[PDB]
Amino acid sequence: AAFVKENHRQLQARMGDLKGVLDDLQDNEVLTENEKELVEQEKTRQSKNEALLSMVEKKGDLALDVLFRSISERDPYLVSYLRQQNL
Amino acid sequence: AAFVKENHRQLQARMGDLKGVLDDLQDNEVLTENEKELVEQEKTRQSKNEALLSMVEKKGDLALDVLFRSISERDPYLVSYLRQQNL
Amino acid sequence: AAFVKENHRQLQARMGDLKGVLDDLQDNEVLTENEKELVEQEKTRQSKNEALLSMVEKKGDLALDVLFRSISERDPYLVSYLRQQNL
Amino acid sequence: AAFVKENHRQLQARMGDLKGVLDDLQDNEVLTENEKELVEQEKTRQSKNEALLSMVEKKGDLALDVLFRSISERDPYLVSYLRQQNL
Amino acid sequence: AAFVKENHRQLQARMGDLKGVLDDLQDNEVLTENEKELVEQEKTRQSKNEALLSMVEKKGDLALDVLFRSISERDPYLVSYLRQQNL
Amino acid sequence: AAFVKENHRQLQARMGDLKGVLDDLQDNEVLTENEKELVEQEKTRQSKNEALLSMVEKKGDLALDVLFRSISERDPYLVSYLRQQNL
Amino acid sequence: AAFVKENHRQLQARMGDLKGVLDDLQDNEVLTENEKELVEQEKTRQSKNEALLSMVEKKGDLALDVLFRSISERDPYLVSYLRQQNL
Amino acid sequence: AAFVKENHRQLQARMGDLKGVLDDLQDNEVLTENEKELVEQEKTRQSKNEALLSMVEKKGDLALDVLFRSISERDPYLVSYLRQQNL
Amino acid sequence: AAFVKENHRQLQARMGDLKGVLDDLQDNEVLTENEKELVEQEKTRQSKNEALLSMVEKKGDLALDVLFRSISERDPYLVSYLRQQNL
Amino acid sequence: AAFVKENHRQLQARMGDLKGVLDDLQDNEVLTENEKELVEQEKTRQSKNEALLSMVEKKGDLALDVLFRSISERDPYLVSYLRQQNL
Amino acid sequence: AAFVKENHRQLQARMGDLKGVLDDLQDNEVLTENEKELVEQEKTRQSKNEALLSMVEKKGDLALDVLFRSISERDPYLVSYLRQQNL
Amino acid sequence: AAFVKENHRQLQARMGDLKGVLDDLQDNEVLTENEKELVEQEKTRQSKNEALLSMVEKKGDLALDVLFRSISERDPYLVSYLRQQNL
């Protein structure tokens, strides 16, 4: 959870395609259908990432954990990238 | 990695057919199937190269290194060409 | 290399059968198998010559030199012919 | 008419594309052009369905009947589905 | 019907070419022409499968049964595959 | 099944003419006519092998077994060759 | 003009490809380039026909006459078809 | 000017896209950028036309004349249409 | 006309080469050059049959009659075959 | 230039294969590689001619002159044909 | 800069493909990524040109000079065209 | 700070998109979320810039300095533009 909040800007920049991430968060009841649609409405990837992160952080730490695992599985070079840049 | 960013325009122009490169990047889990298809959607080789380079730079340095080695194996006259033109 | 670019149209018209030239460029790793096949797909000799020349120019100066030497050995009246017409 | 009010929530969820239904209601002078446009402005299908149903219910029983026949013709598995779920 | 909902992700992945299935669903009036066109608009097979499944689930149980029988006739190795993986 | 997936690249390279294999898979209802035609559309043998293998893996383990037996009967030096190279 | 308004729904269904009709209406200064592009933006033929008809009716009777003559020249079986169905 | 005031309702209905008209009125300093944006904010074409007409009438007769010439150039069937219907 | 609609699927399967039929339909001004080319674009015979039938049915009964006579002259075993299978 | 604009439709119909003309326009820097590819994307000769003419007219009179001379060299019966039909 | 402002309307009409120009302005730090995306969102070339010109004028004279040089390099017949029409 | 106050009108006209600037001011705790949303409510860019400037000036000199550095990083041609025009 802390890792996600501290890297909010970089995740806003480098998260990438959220379709699979949105699918994961929808399978775990973290997001409703309406919320996912609201995330898909955004025009650019930066706005999509901003909306998704800002909405997930509110719900609690568990949602941040599910988001962290989903992003970790989807792309293994970005968690490692930010983990190395924070060092 | 730096070599790829500095030669972004020239690689955008002269990379050529990515099918083997796309196969390498997919075997190393740098790209998903969805991402590879999104790269293949483009109409021209210039747009394909633009999409591939722009997406690979985002992921991190390791992806740039794998891309550099794969392109180096695929064509030895372009790595030598750019290496000579930078001199 | 410059000689090849300057006579692009005339080489497009008068190069002729590329099978031996394609064999040379393939032995020197200038072309892959896929690229040679793509050159062989073209229907007429003008399109074959156009594809081969346009692809060789992209790779770099070394490829143009290998192509020039291969064409020079394969046919001695075309290098001499163009060399005389440029005068 | 009663069937529409009693199943308002389920119709809000499962009506689907209203373009044909909106065309029917416009041909029968139940809706004006402005009202149809206002229904199409909504962002999601749930909001479109809610707006359309809420606007049709006010007008009267006859409008509800026209809506029921139009929806019945458009999709035959939804009237039968809801008729079975009410049992 | 339950079999389709429980295997939503796997069917989303492995359904394949929908032309014959879409033809069946159009012959059985489960889908209109507009809906079939909207399913064919998608760029990849994963998105086509997602749209088709999500739209079929909405209509009701009968549509889910027709989809199950149509997929069963079209490909006998996928119904058998999922039936074996659920065991 | 594992033998086919692990050697996907080598089978992609050395399988050869698929007409007999496609005939086998068509007689066993693993492939439809449309799928066989789509495999035959490809221009090169590498693309034909890639399409066929990628489509067969999706269907399930039984299809992979039929593919292995068909390739084994068609050419006995390729199953033995790959079995020897994995050692 | 009256024939076009009275057959609005049927023309919405059966007009077909508008490219030639749009070219005619553009040659007669009934539509601008922007308007033709807006008609071409639509996804399906039904939406294209709906937009075109709705835009042509607005401008006046002369535009409806030009549309009737252009459609009459382009396809002679549809004017005869609707003319027969109104009888 | 009088023609515009007397046909306020019909112009409110049939004026259409104002982007070109707004561009003309902006080139002639009849409207500022802020006013044009205020016209573009409206949701429907009827409200846009109402806002534009109501704003132009206040400014004076010359603005109404410029509006008349701009509408005359933009669409030649609507000025002729209203002129014929007023007869 | 009815015979064509009732046997739409079987004609989709067994019509075969349309070149002569397309020639007839072009001689009778039922199809334009563009439409014939659009039918010829399809990759398989099933898709060609689908495009041709779907386009001919739209135009009207006369086009279906011309299609019936042309196919009847081209092949006398398919009209007889379907006429026998409907019995 | 005027000859080209006035006969836009006839050139749109009868120009034919543009490969040589495209080569000329590419040699004179009237078209880039991207523009030539965009012209080559079209499916039919009518669409290719429409794209080429519409793009060349935009650039200016000089481009129209180069196009007229190139078409004049490629085919001497079409310039003479249109020159005779305008008389 | 003055040349760009004075020819604002004609440049809005005749600028053409902006991909290369956008590449220039992005390489020279005149535009951010968000701004380039906002320029690419527009539907037509007229709206793209309107957004691009209106945004470039705001930044200052230096941006206008860079834009003028980029447009000059991209197309040499349009700067000459406007230069000749202004005379 | 003085540079910001003296160019308040010009910054009101030419600041542009504040999303990045708002992000900076929010990262530096100059603005809360509520204030950023209140700035985003405004209808035009002129009103957004007016609200942002008017709110930042009140808070103090440090906020004006952070605003100057953020605008300097966001756009390097506007700080140079105003600095040159004040000369």
Coordinates of N, CA, C and O in Angstrom, one line a residue, chain J residues 32-67:
Chain J
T32 N 5.5 12.6 -50.3 CA 6.4 11.9 -49.5 C 6.1 10.4 -49.6 O 5.3 10.0 -50.4
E33 N 6.9 9.6 -48.9 CA 6.7 8.2 -48.9 C 5.3 7.9 -48.2 O 4.6 7.0 -48.7
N34 N 5.1 8.5 -47.1 CA 3.8 8.3 -46.4 C 2.6 8.6 -47.3 O 1.6 7.8 -47.3
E35 N 2.6 9.7 -48.0 CA 1.5 10.0 -48.9 C 1.3 8.9 -50.0 O 0.2 8.5 -50.2
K36 N 2.4 8.5 -50.6 CA 2.3 7.5 -51.6 C 1.7 6.2 -51.0 O 0.9 5.5 -51.6
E37 N 2.2 5.8 -49.8 CA 1.6 4.6 -49.2 C 0.1 4.8 -48.9 O -0.7 3.9 -49.2
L38 N -0.3 6.0 -48.5 CA -1.7 6.3 -48.2 C -2.5 6.1 -49.5 O -3.7 5.7 -49.5
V39 N -1.9 6.5 -50.7 CA -2.6 6.3 -51.9 C -2.7 4.8 -52.3 O -3.7 4.3 -52.8
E40 N -1.6 4.1 -52.0 CA -1.6 2.7 -52.3 C -2.5 1.8 -51.4 O -2.8 0.7 -51.8
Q41 N -2.9 2.3 -50.3 CA -3.8 1.6 -49.4 C -5.1 1.3 -50.0 O -5.7 0.2 -49.7
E42 N -5.7 2.2 -50.8 CA -7.0 2.1 -51.3 C -7.2 0.7 -52.0 O -6.3 0.2 -52.6
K43 N -8.4 0.2 -52.0 CA -8.8 -1.1 -52.5 C -9.0 -1.1 -54.0 O -8.6 -2.0 -54.7
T44 N -9.7 -0.1 -54.6 CA -10.1 0.0 -56.0 C -9.3 1.2 -56.6 O -8.7 2.0 -56.0
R45 N -9.4 1.1 -58.0 CA -8.7 2.2 -58.8 C -9.4 3.5 -58.6 O -8.8 4.6 -58.7
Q46 N -10.8 3.5 -58.5 CA -11.5 4.7 -58.3 C -11.1 5.4 -57.0 O -11.0 6.7 -57.0
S47 N -11.0 4.7 -55.9 CA -10.6 5.3 -54.7 C -9.1 5.8 -54.7 O -8.8 6.9 -54.2
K48 N -8.2 5.1 -55.4 CA -6.9 5.5 -55.5 C -6.8 6.8 -56.3 O -6.1 7.8 -55.9
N49 N -7.5 6.9 -57.4 CA -7.6 8.1 -58.2 C -8.2 9.3 -57.5 O -7.7 10.4 -57.5
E50 N -9.2 9.0 -56.7 CA -9.8 10.0 -55.9 C -8.9 10.6 -54.8 O -8.7 11.8 -54.7
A51 N -8.2 9.7 -54.1 CA -7.2 10.1 -53.1 C -6.1 10.9 -53.8 O -5.7 12.0 -53.3
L52 N -5.5 10.4 -54.9 CA -4.4 11.1 -55.5 C -4.8 12.5 -56.0 O -4.1 13.5 -55.7
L53 N -5.9 12.6 -56.8 CA -6.3 13.9 -57.3 C -6.6 14.8 -56.1 O -6.2 16.0 -56.1
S54 N -7.4 14.4 -55.1 CA -7.8 15.3 -54.0 C -6.5 15.8 -53.3 O -6.5 16.9 -52.8
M55 N -5.5 14.9 -53.1 CA -4.3 15.4 -52.4 C -3.5 16.3 -53.3 O -2.9 17.2 -52.7
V56 N -3.4 16.0 -54.6 CA -2.5 16.8 -55.4 C -3.1 18.2 -55.6 O -2.4 19.2 -55.6
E57 N -4.4 18.3 -55.7 CA -5.1 19.7 -55.9 C -4.7 20.6 -54.7 O -4.6 21.8 -54.9
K58 N -4.7 20.0 -53.5 CA -4.4 20.8 -52.3 C -3.1 21.5 -52.4 O -3.0 22.7 -52.0
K59 N -2.1 20.8 -52.8 CA -0.7 21.3 -52.7 C -0.5 22.6 -53.5 O 0.2 23.5 -53.0
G60 N -1.0 22.7 -54.7 CA -0.9 23.9 -55.4 C -0.9 23.6 -56.9 O -1.1 22.5 -57.4
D61 N -0.7 24.7 -57.7 CA -0.7 24.6 -59.2 C 0.5 23.8 -59.7 O 0.3 23.1 -60.7
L62 N 1.6 24.1 -59.1 CA 2.8 23.4 -59.6 C 2.7 21.9 -59.6 O 3.1 21.2 -60.5
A63 N 2.2 21.4 -58.4 CA 2.0 19.9 -58.3 C 1.0 19.4 -59.4 O 1.2 18.3 -59.9
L64 N -0.1 20.2 -59.7 CA -1.0 19.9 -60.7 C -0.3 19.8 -62.1 O -0.6 19.0 -62.9
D65 N 0.6 20.7 -62.3 CA 1.4 20.7 -63.6 C 2.2 19.5 -63.7 O 2.3 18.8 -64.7
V66 N 3.0 19.1 -62.6 CA 3.8 17.9 -62.6 C 2.9 16.7 -62.9 O 3.3 15.8 -63.6
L67 N 1.8 16.6 -62.2 CA 0.8 15.5 -62.4 C 0.4 15.4 -63.8 O 0.3 14.4 -64.4

